[PDB]
Each structure stands twice: as C-alpha cells, then as structure tokens.
Design a protein around this ligand. Sequence first.
Ligand SMILES: CC[C@@H](Cc1ccc(OC)c(C(=O)NCc2ccc(Oc3ccc(F)cc3)c(F)c2)c1)C(=O)O
Ligand SMILES: CC[C@@H](Cc1ccc(OC)c(C(=O)NCc2ccc(Oc3ccc(F)cc3)c(F)c2)c1)C(=O)O
Lengths: 265, 265
Amino acid sequence: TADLKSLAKRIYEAYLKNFNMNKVKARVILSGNPPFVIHDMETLCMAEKTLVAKLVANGIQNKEAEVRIFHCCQCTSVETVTELTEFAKAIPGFANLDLNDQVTLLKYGVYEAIFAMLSSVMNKDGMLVAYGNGFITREFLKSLRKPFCDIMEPKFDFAMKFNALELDDSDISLFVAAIICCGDRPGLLNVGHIEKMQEGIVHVLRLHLQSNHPDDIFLFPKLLQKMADLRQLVTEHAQLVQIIKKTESDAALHPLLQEIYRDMY
Amino acid sequence: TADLKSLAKRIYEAYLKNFNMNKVKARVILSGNPPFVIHDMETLCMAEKTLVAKLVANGIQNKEAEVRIFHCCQCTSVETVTELTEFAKAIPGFANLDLNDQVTLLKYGVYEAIFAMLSSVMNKDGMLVAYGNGFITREFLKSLRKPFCDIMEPKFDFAMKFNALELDDSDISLFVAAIICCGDRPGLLNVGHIEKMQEGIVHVLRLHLQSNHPDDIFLFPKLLQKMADLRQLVTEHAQLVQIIKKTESDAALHPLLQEIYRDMY
Ligand SMILES: CC[C@@H](Cc1ccc(OC)c(C(=O)NCc2ccc(Oc3ccc(F)cc3)c(F)c2)c1)C(=O)O
Ligand SMILES: CC[C@@H](Cc1ccc(OC)c(C(=O)NCc2ccc(Oc3ccc(F)cc3)c(F)c2)c1)C(=O)O
C-alpha cells in the first residue's frame, strides 16, 4: 500500500536524519581521518589525548583506565538517547501520545534500541567509537578488569547473530520504531492507543521485510525474538551496572542514565 | 576436575550462544508477543499471513497446506543445521579434525541432534514454532493427510520420554556434543582421533550427570540408549522423507537437506 510504503520511508528518513551513525556509513569506515585503533593501554591513552583530551588532562588525578572507558561508554549512550528521542517523533501517533507515556516508552526502549543499533558499528574484531574516529578491539575490551569487561562481550554476542540477519538501515529503522512502541511497558497510561500505534509499525515492518528480504521467510519472527532477546540483554545489563555502582566508587553514573535505570527492572 | 568442569561449561556456554531456542526460554514461553496457537486450518492460515507471509502470497498458486507445513519444517531444520555447525567448534578437537571428517560427523549427527533438541520446545499438547512466536498443536499435526502426519508423531513420542528425564540445558549441550562426536559414523578418515575426542566428551557427560542428577543412578546409560533410539528415529525419518519425495511432486526438498540425506542410510 502507498500509505504503508510511505510510512516505512518516513521512518527510514527520520532514522537517516537523526542518527549520526548508520550502517552504510559504518561499513564504509570499517572497510578502511581513518579510524585510530585502540587495542591496548598505550593506544587507549593515545586515543584519549586526541579524541577526548579533556578526560585525561588531570595528571595523576585521572581515573583508572576501566573507569575512563566506562565514562566514555555512558557519554555515547547519552548522545544516542538524545538521537532516539528526536527520532521517536516520526513514529505515527507517538507525538500524539500523552507526554508521560512518551517518557515511559523511551525509558524502557532506549537501551534495547542502543544495543540493537550498536551492532551496526560492530564486527567480530571490535567496534567503532567516537563518532567513527576510533576502532576499539573486542579483545582489548575483554582484557579490562572485572567487572568492566563483563559489560562488553554480551553485546558483541548479540550483535554477531543480529548482523548475520543482514538487515539494512531501512529494516533497522522500523525495528527501532517497533522497539520504542511496545505497549507492554510498565506504567503506561493509554495502553490501548499504544498497542494500536505498535500494531501499525509492526504491520509496516512485516510487509517491509517481505519486500526487502524475500529470501528469508522467517525474518519477521526472527526479529520478534530479537526484541525479546534485547529485553533480557537490558535486564542483565542493568544488573551489571548496579554491581559497578555499588562496588566501584569512582564509576559515577551520568544523571540522565541514572533516571533511565531508576525503577526500570 | 577443574579442566573437566571447565569443558562442560565451555560446551554449555557455546550451546547458549549458538542456539536461538533453549529449554529455559522455551519453558517460559510454554507457560504463558505471546505465541499464536495453530490448532486448525483457519489458524494455520492466519499464522502464515503473520509469521511467513511470503509463503502464502501467491494466491491460488499457493501449495496444499500439508506441503507448506513440510516446507516450513525444512526451513526450521536448515536453520538448526547452521546453529549446530557453529556449536560444533567448541567441542575440543573438533576444529582440529580433518575438514572432511567434520563434514561426516555433522552429516550423520545433525538430525539426531535436531530431534533431541526439538524435545525442549515440545509438550504433550504441541510445540513451539517460528522462533517462539507460534505454538502448533500435536492434534493438528496428527490431522494432516498422510504421509505428512506420519512425520510428526514419532518425534513427540520420543520427546515425551526424553523430557521425563528432566534434563537441563547443561545436560543437553553435552548430549548434543556427544551425538556429534560419534566415531562409528560411515566414511570417517581419522576414526582413532574421533574416538578419543568422543571419549573426552562422554567422560565429561558422565561426570556432569553424576553431579547434576544425583537422584538418577542410571541416567548416563539411559542417555546412551537415547542416542541409539535417535539413530533409529533418524533412519525411519529418512525413509519417510524418501516416500514423500517420490510420491509428492509438490514437496521440494531443500538442497542442504538433500545433501545431508544423500547416501546417509
Ligand atoms: C557504560 C555502559 C553503557 C552501555 C554500553 C554497553 C556496551 C558498549 O559497547 C560494547 C557500549 C558502547 O558505547 N560502546 C562503544 C564505546 C566503547 C568504548 C569507549 O571508550 C572510549 C574511550 C576512549 C576513546 F578515545 C574512545 C572510546 C567508548 F567511548 C564507546 C555501551 C551504558 O550503560 O550506558
Ligand atoms: C520436513 C521434516 C523435517 C524434520 C522435522 C520433523 C518433525 C518436526 O516437528 C514434529 C519438525 C519441526 O521442525 N517442527 C516444528 C515446526 C512445525 C510446523 C511448522 O510449520 C509452520 C507453518 C506455518 C507457521 F506459521 C508456523 C509453522 C514449522 F515451521 C516448524 C521437523 C526435516 O526433515 O528436516
């Protein structure tokens, strides 16, 4: 249908406009300001001086390397939450929802969306960082002392299977919209209206996948399962973040992320 | 032993990573995107339009319902063969085997592994389908016209007895590894090395069952018998598939499955 084809394009266009990184751009960079490779402590410190020089300009008062990385990961998340919040406006009916419901949907959806979209900048060897200007290796992230190493690898595990689906940005934009419009989030005021909004996006996603991936007759239920997988990934992530908060006094939580996690799971 | 305890954990972790469905996840779903129930032709057609819409988008050129189900079963098998192939890498010595021997082990092992793992998504009333998003009833599958109904019920019969053993994913991962590392498959090049690889996994499986199931002193020989039962189940399955291929011109065999069955039994 023309209105459904146009809805899929409106959401794709809103995705290309609001996210600084997309999968086409990421794949160009990942093929080879070429990305500076962070693969050990020496190169982490070099990258810091060029790409986040403010963070390491304190001398002996700088934080432990694992804590600096954790801070930079949170800063990345904060930026993606801002992009996700503006993206959400192109989802039909989202801006027509109660202001409090918009908050609840974004609260439970953003980290599912973050980990889905992280896959676009990940390969089996590492991931893009710092607006495409660095590449940090998966082995280096695994090498961080506990518990900071444990933040990283489950996200690569998710991403490698997600990337094997060979989605493109036109698919992922609709998937991220579908994540944001979940009617079963806790605390929603107008569940009925959200379910109808969800049904419309999921309807467009199913038709789009049929059209864009005729080779994979199971792709739509595969992506439904990935949404469930992402919910569990986020629950587990929040638990690990809580461990870091209680046992690592130097790893301050950004206040915006603090409020996202507050009363989440 | 720490190296044997770690081997059992390495195989369990490889199982949790490589299979989209596991028994914990399946049991959560089976307790009640909740699964759409396929219990008759009306609901089969509804599920098709939502979960495999490409297959029924041909109008009067669609296949008979039994043939569409057969195709969707083959597609499920093809996906599980892919997961099984990547799982096999965590079995110690498997990646060190001759490339041709890896092929032979997977050739004779995958359907034994498929039917063992199908049990995790089966109960006495039906089974999960389509990445956890559908539940098709055992009575509906029995209702299919011959010979397609005869594909289904022997697998439920096997599964109900297998499930009564109350294995968990830590057991099943080792059992599936033991299935893949059978040294008596036809055509093997380095039988001696495979037998030693088998002995190591079977050794770990025996110790694991002692530790995880202290209430069942016969559990290890019970599972040895289930491996033999699965071999016979596969021989019988291949015979029925051959009948369908010869007598049902609309039931095309997927080429990957065609090669698995080629010169099997
Ligand atoms: C705190 C956890 C998050 C969720 C989370 C979980 C996993 C992740 O990746 C697997 C990521 C993430 O953003 N990875 C990209 C990234 C990696 C390292 C970085 O560190 C540097 C440091 C110096 C440099 F010069 C360049 C990069 C960085 F800045 C971004 C985020 C949250 O709870 O919000
Ligand atoms: C061809 C035989 C196989 C071996 C075999 C034998 C027995 C089985 O189950 C007892 C299964 C199997 O996979 N059962 C799950 C399943 C069931 C129905 C499905 O049909 C639909 C249709 C429409 C839907 F919307 C959802 C599901 C489906 F997709 C998957 C497989 C092969 O020789 O490879």
